[PDB]
Each structure stands twice: as structure tokens, then as C-alpha cells.
């Protein structure tokens, strides 16, 4: 799973590692705290993957809605779709009907996701045609 697997060199923008200062010959890595009580995963701080869409080692911020759901597909590259089950109330019959929504969310390499897992996603800016959410917490299922 080599980092440099593209036509262009993968780098974090404007994080300059000087090849001349002195030793500690490893590239400096930037990361942030997303806030709202979410911890930065260890793979984000000591990792080596480059992901501009990562909430922790990337330029996207988390703001707006916080959602949770069950992962139903991990067949895209760095993107998952999660299922949100809920119950719709029909007043005339004083009852409920089962409904669901599929939401596409970016998954950072800092996490590990498999189908059948519950994840918490935070809302970011549009980062794809269908993606507006980004994984912040993975619960094994």
C-alpha cells in the first residue's frame, strides 16, 4: 500500500521538509484536532498516507450535522456508503413504517472499516458529487 501510487507526487501542501538542516531524516507531517470531542487517531499523527480529504491530516473541516449509521459497502476507494434506518410516523394510523437512507461518506486511511460496522460521520464541504460526510469514529460490529 505504497503512498506514491499516482502520476503526481503525493504531498501535504505547504508542509516543507528541508533536506539540508540536519538529521531526523523523516518528512514532517501536519495534522489537526477536529474538535467536538473527537480524538485524532494514532494513524493520523504517526502515519504516512497522504489524504487531502482526511479530517485530521487533510484540508477539510468538520461542521454542521453529525450522523451515525451502519456501513453497507466498502467497495469504493476511500469512500463508503452507510445505511440510516429510522421510523416514519403516520398520524392517521397512529403507527410507524420502516424507512432508510443511504449516505456516501469519505473514509480516511487512518480508520479501518468493514461492512457491518457502525460509524459516526461529520459534515464537510462537498468533496464529491454525492459525498458530504466524513468518517470520524469506527465501532466494530
Amino acid at each position: 500500500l505504497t503512498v506514491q501510487s499516482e502520476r503526481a507526487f503525493q504531498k501535504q501542501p505547504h508542509i516543507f521538509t528541508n533536506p539540508k538542516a540536519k538529521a531526523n531524516k523523516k518528512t514532517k507531517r501536519w495534522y489537526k484536532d477536529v474538535g467536538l470531542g473527537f480524538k485524532t487517531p494514532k494513524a493520523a499523527i504517526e502515519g504516512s498516507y497522504i489524504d487531502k480529504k482526511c479530517p485530521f491530516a487533510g484540508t477539510v473541516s468538520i461542521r454542521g450535522k453529525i450522523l451515525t449509521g451502519t456501513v453497507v459497502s466498502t467497495k469504493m476507494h476511500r469512500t463508503i456508503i452507510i445505511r440510516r434506518d429510522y421510523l416514519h410516523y403516520v398520524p392517521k394510523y397512529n403507527r410507524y413504517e420502516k424507512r432508510h437512507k443511504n449516505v456516501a461518506a469519505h473514509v480516511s486511511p487512518a480508520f479501518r472499516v468493514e461492512e457491518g460496522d457502525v460509524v459516526t460521520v461529520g459534515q464537510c464541504r462537498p468533496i464529491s458529487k454525492t459525498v458530504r460526510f466524513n468518517v470520524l469514529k469506527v465501532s466494530a460490529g
Binding site: 467536538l36 470531542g37 461542521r63
Partner: protein, 260 residues
Amino acid sequence: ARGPKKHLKRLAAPSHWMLDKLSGTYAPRPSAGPHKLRESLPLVVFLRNRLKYALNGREVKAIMMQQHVQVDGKVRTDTTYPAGFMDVITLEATNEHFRLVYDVKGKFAVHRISAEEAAYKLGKVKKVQLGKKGVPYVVTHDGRTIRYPDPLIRANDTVKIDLATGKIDDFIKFDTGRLVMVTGGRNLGRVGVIVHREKHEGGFDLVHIKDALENTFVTRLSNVFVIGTEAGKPWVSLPKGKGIKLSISEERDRRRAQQG
């Protein structure tokens, strides 16, 4: 649709203006300026519907073209100038000064003030950051920016602005026990004291308040306005009513006490 709107339908006008239903199709659209369109009080409304000095809008323009009207110490020739909270209105030719302050009813009551008090105004601090050349500044709730503010002034604090010079006289810290006035929501106009500020990161901050009559009522932090250091000691003159809420039975009893 293709650009900014310039008319205001009468039924779309804010409900605190007390506009009659049948006078016409339109209502004065407040100009762009220091206060929000919905939370302002255009001067034509204040001088026609409230003071009853002018009989109609054309007389409002006859009055204001002769330099009579001042807001915050400056002559305004705009019939639809967006006067808002704390704004000082001065009528020199009649030698008469006013401050727009909400009443407990939720309206901009007509409040006569003295000439000495008509020399400053309070202002809620919205943000502070450094400008060009490293100079810090604060922004008040009326779009006023003041350079070189006190290093301790933060958001939601209130500064005492000197109208002649636009400089900060003194400020009030936001903390528990402060005399405040509610500037939005259901509790518009009611004066209380801070009891507990409840924090919600990413969401909304709630502020528990208490009146002089011990009734506790909570409000969004955005609707709070610090007006005094402690209970009973504001830095501005209060409307007739002291910002105290009465039940419908109580107001009926007081009306029948002063009229029967």
C-alpha cells in the same frame, strides 16, 4: 431574482412597527446601514407613526431635509435610515432626545432621555481580531469598528461608546450576576440578571436569567445584551416599565386601578 429587492409589502413588514393593514400596499423598506432590516426602525416610522409629528411621508422628507433629525450625533437625510437598538435620536429644533430601547412588550418604545445621557450609547461586542498593520479592533452590534480596544474586551462584552469621538469610555465583562436585556426571541425587552451560562460546543449557548421578581427564563446567548454591572444599576435609562413582565390578569388589574 436578477438582483436586490427595493420594495417592501406592508404585510411583510416587521410586526413590531405597528403598521395598520389598510393604509396602502407598501411599507417603508429600511435602507442598508448599521442594523438589520428586520431588527431596525426606519426613521419615517419613528417620526410619523410614533411621535405623530409628521402627517405623511412627504412631511417626513420636509422635516429631514432641514437638518432637524440626528442619529448618534449625526444628521441623516435618509427618510428610511435603519435606526436600531441603543440608537440615540435627537431633535434639536424641539430640543428633544430619544433612545430606541425595547419595551417588555417587544416594541421600540418612545423613550425621552436627557441631553447628558444623549451623549453616548452601549454596544455589544461581536468579535475582535487584528486588522491591517497588526492593529486589533472590535465590532459592535451596530457595525461600528473601534481600533485599539482594551486588551481585555472579548465577545459578548458591552462597551460604552462616546458619540462625539466614537471612542470607548468603559466596558462591562460578561459573567454571572450581570444586568442584561434580551434583544431577541419570546423574551424580547425583559431585563434580568445572569444566573448561569450553559455551553454547547458547535451548537447554541443558553443563558439562564432572572427578573427582579424571581422568575427564571432562559434565552440564547445571541439574544443577550449586557446593560449594567449589577442588579438595579444599568448604564442607560430604562423604558417606563423597568423591563418587567406582567401576567394578563396583572395588567388588567393595573389598568382598572388607574382607570377605575
